[PDB]
Amino acid sequence: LIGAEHVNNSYECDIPIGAGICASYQTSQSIIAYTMSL
Amino acid sequence: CSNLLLQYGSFCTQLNRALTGIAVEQDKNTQEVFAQVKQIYKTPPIKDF
Ligand SMILES: *[C@@H]1O[C@H](CO)[C@@H](O)[C@H](O)[C@H]1NC(C)=O
């Protein structure tokens, strides 16, 4: 994955990717990738 | 081989769309079974039931 910065915290994801990690647009504001919160 | 594949690229599009639909269907299938609740309940430390 390129263009998305990984962050250790977890929120509820909206755009699925696979293997338990999604991507989302969150605070400027940029696209981030994080593990899903069940 | 690719120069003759533009006459069946429509068929290839149908196959790719069917496989993508199958994949997203299988991804959705797990959500309708195990994700019944949206709150994760922790087991109590007391095991006296
Ligand atoms: C997230 O926090 C954990 C807490 O120990 C740390 O180990 C990890 O390096 C952090 N990740 C980032 C990307 O800051």
Curated annotation (Swiss-Prot), chain B:
Source organism per UniProt: Severe acute respiratory syndrome coronavirus 2
Identification of the protein by name: Spike protein S2
Biological role: Precursor of the fusion protein processed in the biosynthesis of the S protein and the formation of virus particle. Mediates fusion of the virion and cellular membranes by functioning as a class I viral fusion protein. Contains two viral fusion peptides that are unmasked after cleavage. The S2/S2' cleavage occurs during virus entry at the cell membrane by host TMPRSS2 or during endocytosis by host CSTL.
Outcome of substituting D48H: In strain: B.1.1.318
Gene that this polypeptide is encoded by: S
Residues of the full protein shown: 749 to 797 of 1273
Annotated effect of mutating D48Y: In strain: 19B/501Y, Omicron/BA.1, Omicron/BA.2, Omicron/BA.2.12.1, Omicron/BA.2.75, Omicron/BA.4, Omicron/BA.5, Omicron/BQ.1.1, Omicron/XBB.1.5, Omicron/EG.5.1
